[PDB]
């Protein structure tokens, strides 16, 4: 616990190797559905920069992609607290490795703020959280969309 300090969501690498076509991972973490991953869908446009982003949404603000590069790598903003993640695909043979890259960003808080009011829990949670999600979650989009599988 002793290098959780000052996170707000730092640089998290991830990395996950899915058992589709390098095509089929990009569709899923560049469709609106993929993107929502199903969890509350919302109508994501795959745009080279959505918005820009300057300042610290005070009002409403959606997610809004940052660059995304063709089916190599994406990178997109969601301003709940500002987590900025960006997703890479390996290309490999008979599989796909898929990058994940969490880095928050906003003012650098040592919290992410309102999400949920703790550092060190957060960053555990997102560790756990993250490892599990991109796992099955993409390996699912990417092998089929959805039917019956709890998630956490």
């Not at 918005?51 to 969601?78: I, M, R």
């Not at 709940?80 to 390996?90: A, C, D, R, S």
């Not at 560790?127 to 979650?137: L, P």
Request: proline residues 5%.
């Amino acid at each position: 616990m002793a290098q959780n300090n000052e996170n707000a969501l730092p640089d998290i690498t991830k990395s996950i190797t899915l058992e589709a076509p390098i095509q089929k991972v990009w569709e899923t973490v560049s469709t609106s559905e993929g993107i929502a991953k199903w969890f509350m869908p919302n109508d994501f446009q795959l745009k080279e920069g959505q918005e820009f982003h300057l300042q610290s949404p005070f009002g409403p603000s959606p997610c809004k992609v940052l660059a995304v590069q063709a089916p190599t790598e994406l990178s997109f903003e969601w301003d709940t607290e500002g987590w900025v993640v960006t997703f890479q695909l390996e290309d490999l043979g008979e599989k796909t490795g898929f990058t994940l890259i969490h880095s928050g960003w906003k003012e650098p808080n040592e919290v992410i703020g309102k999400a949920n009011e703790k550092s060190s829990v957060v960053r555990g949670k997102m560790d756990g959280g993250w490892t599990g999600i991109v796992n099955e979650r993409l390996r699912k989009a990417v092998e089929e969309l959805e039917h019956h599988h709890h998630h956490h």
